[model samples]
Target: MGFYQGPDNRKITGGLKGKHRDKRKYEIGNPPTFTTLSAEDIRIKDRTLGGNFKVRLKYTTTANVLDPATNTAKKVKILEILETPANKELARRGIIIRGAKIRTEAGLAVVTSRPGQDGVINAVLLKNESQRS
Candidate 1:
């Protein structure tokens, strides 16, 4: 009933892909959430498939970092973004996405959690390169 989640109307084989029926209520989809870095943590509430709901992350400045060597985790303040997996524009915008590298008080780390979908950011400290002060 809202955003349509149907497949592409064009076929990759170079032909039109006809739709069997009109858009259905179940096929409704929602827009993507783009998480960004901030001085304070921020969340966005959203409705899910059924009776469930999701706490979407809008912005954050802290993340849980796990140090593999010690097998321990700690909460650390995020400083800034280092690099993003796909686009440089997203990195420039300070988007906090999974697999993105971030600079934190604990050192450099790789994002392991989906901030947009999971509402919380978790990362793994790069112990080999964490010697910098």
Candidate 2:
């Protein structure tokens, strides 16, 4: 309990949805080790809160693409990974993390969100038409 918050007093109301119980002083049972994800997609489903839920997107397909103009998260098919400084095989297999460029039906976009951390992919729109570059 050095740097962590003390357990919540049950007498008081807690959590956005339900009452939160006392959590451990430290947590280490989580954290997914992302690797050279090929066609096979596997995911671990854990429950916490709506906010913390589905944060670990270990090995999957179909990332969400965000359009700044429309101000929405949609229209994102992760066609392929162009390159990445993370790993060579990761690049070859089209495994994406943060700072990786991907081809979408809309345009080529660089991923701002980390796939390993957050479950969904958030990318920005770029200048490219339907014809594919």
Candidate 3:
């Protein structure tokens, strides 16, 4: 339920489970980052398992866009989010996720990095499609 990784209510052999196996810290669920378009870049750091730190992106204004034809990357300002393949609502909310198409200063781009997990936005430029509304 809502990304919970704890044991199920019903135990093995069709027996009703009790509170014997309580929820552990590792089994706890975390919320989504839901990074969105913004005027300034906003990032948050979280303490993950062990001594690792997770960079969570809250809002971003630019992204590193790779040009396949030129074999190079350039930092460009984000213009607008076209659509999100993951969810239509995310596009309306301007949420940036991997695989989401967006309009950038350089050109139209497809997001490749996990903004939530990596805290950075990396996109691949699309040269063939120029039709824009």
Candidate 4:
């Protein structure tokens, strides 16, 4: 009788989407103060919904190009890090959001609150356009 070894466990080589993702390397200067928005600022008709709520961030940095249309600094949020390429492309043309995350504060913590939901205290990336910078 021949002794049999276990099955081969070698990894199949191919690019995997959102696999073993690493936080993008970036530099940190002074961290921005993320203040929670009031009910009036949010302007929600009903104030008692529960889900992954989004809050706008505001800050200034030398990395972004100014936009003339809205005439405000800006960025976008897609709830995922992998979808930032398109957004980053737009930022190169000097477009900014008034309440977008700045490059210097990409992985910094932001404030969140919900009436009956668990308060979220964590770091969140702004969006793709702001990340490439």
RMSD of each: 41.5, 41.6, 40.6, 45.3
TM-score of each: 0.42, 0.41, 0.43, 0.15
Better model by lDDT, 3 or 4? 3
**Best model number under lDDT:** 3
Which residue pairs of candidate 4 clash? 73-96, 73-97, 73-98, 74-96, 74-97, 84-128, 87-129, 88-129
**Which scores higher on TM-score, 1 or 3?**
3
Candidate 3 RMSD computed on C-alpha atoms after optimal superposition onto the true structure:
40.6
lDDT of 3 by residue, 1-133 (tens): 4776777696459666666665656764897788667434333223232475788856455677889999998777778777646665755444577877887888889888754332346889878564645
Tens-place lDDT digits, model 4, residues 11-45: 78898667575776877869888987787746675
Total backbone clashes of candidate 2, pairs 3 or more residues apart or in separate chains: 0
Could you tell which candidate, 1 or 2, scores higher by TM-score? Answer: 1
Residue 70's lDDT in candidate 4: 41
Question: Which candidate tops TM-score?
Answer: 3
Candidate 4: segments with Cα more than 4 A from true spot:
1-88, 105-133
What is the lDDT of every predicted structure here?
A: 0.68, 0.62, 0.69, 0.36
